Amino acid sequence: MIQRTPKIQVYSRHPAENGKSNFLNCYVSGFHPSDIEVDLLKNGERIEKVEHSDLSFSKDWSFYLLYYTEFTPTEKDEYACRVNHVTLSQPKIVKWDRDM
Amino acid sequence: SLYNTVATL
């Protein structure tokens, strides 16, 4: 049966400014079936309090979700999103680039 | 507001 791989984007809600509160987002979209695992990482380690939007889908039936957590970016801290899905042989990690 | 009379497949 049909299987479609998630597209992944990792980004901040607001333009990033060191020491100012923000939200770190991981947007997963274009995937099927709906079971998916999404973690946000700070310096390689899973962030505990992460929430997500209610499951919905596009015209082509593919699913999308927004995962998010409060964070205050600094000069040195590195953030990432780690995603697993049936279409992915191993977890895919996408790094936060404050310019993307 | 949701539809009130949804038919089964």
Partner: protein, 275 residues
């Protein structure tokens, strides 16, 4: 302008792990306003926008009752489809349903929809006329026959043309601050040296609503379709959207390139240039 109301339903069987998952969400335009989750504690339809919280218990009890009925229907349908396709009891399968209505800029009924998918592909859909059905395959032809005989389209047509658009208009007025607004994109460009002979120019649109936007690059006024990296429009989390478009420009040619932004919230389309 034009507006829409849409409900989306996802049903996922969980063999040996209890009852199937059922999730319902409702939108007006690009704004979510309700949810139901079978797995959540409340077992009620819940508000997800401030304007709908004003509706009384008669509204919430009614949506809770109807959304539970939808859930039961999807529960029964999962079994029916498993039999139609001769599938085993072991596997997880997915049913999706979407329905709703569009009104035009006059706020009158423009279009209705009711579509149904099994395991990620079309199963049955109401045609644009709201009088007949498009069956995607042999199995679906059984459903088509059953529904035609039972005049299922006729009552659905009455909802899509009447009550759906009445409720849409009610939500638009009650949520006027949230729904009859536009947030124009806030725009900027970044410049990042790839090598010593190329630079990436990235054109940003932030904090806009609704989601529909056109972001393009030109070089000496000529379309750079094939050379532009364009990301999918993405939610910011606060009810606005973001998008960017980038081109790689030979160092020194920055002046040839223009970014063009079209959005409902703009008084006139924007042209951005690195200068």
């Amino acid at each position: 302008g034009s507006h829409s109301m849409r409900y989306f339903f996802t049903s996922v069987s969980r063999p040996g792990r209890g009852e199937p998952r059922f999730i319902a969400v409702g939108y007006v335009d690009d704004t979510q306003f309700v949810r139901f989750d079978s797995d959540a504690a409340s077992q009620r339809m819940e508000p997800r926008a401030p304007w709908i919280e004003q509706e009384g218990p008669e509204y919430w009890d009614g949506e809770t009752r109807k959304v539970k009925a939808h859930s039961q229907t999807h529960r029964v349908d999962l079994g029916t489809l498993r039999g139609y396709y001769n599938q085993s009891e072991a596997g997880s399968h997915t049913v999706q349903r979407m329905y709703g209505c569009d009104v035009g800029s006059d706020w009158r009924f423009l279009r209705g929809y009711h579509q149904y998918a099994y395991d990620g592909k079309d199963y049955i859909a109401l045609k644009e006329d709201l009088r007949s059905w498009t069956a995607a395959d042999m199995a679906a032809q059984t459903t088509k026959h059953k529904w035609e005989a039972a005049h299922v389209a006729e009552q659905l047509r009455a909802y899509l043309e009447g009550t759906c658009v009445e409720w849409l208009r009610r939500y638009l007025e009650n949520g006027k601050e949230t729904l009859q607004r536009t947030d124009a994109p806030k725009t900027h460009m970044t410049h990042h040296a790839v090598s010593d002979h190329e630079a990436t120019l990235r054109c940003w649109a932030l904090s806009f609503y609704p989601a529909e936007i056109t972001l393009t690059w030109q070089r000496d006024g000529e379309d750079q379709t094939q050379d532009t990296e364009l990301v999918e429009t993405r939610p910011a989390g606060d009810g606005t959207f973001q998008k960017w478009a980038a081109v790689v420009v030979p160092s020194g040619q920055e002046q040839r390139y223009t970014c063009h932004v079209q959005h409902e919230g703009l008084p006139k389309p924007l042209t951005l240039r690195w200068e």
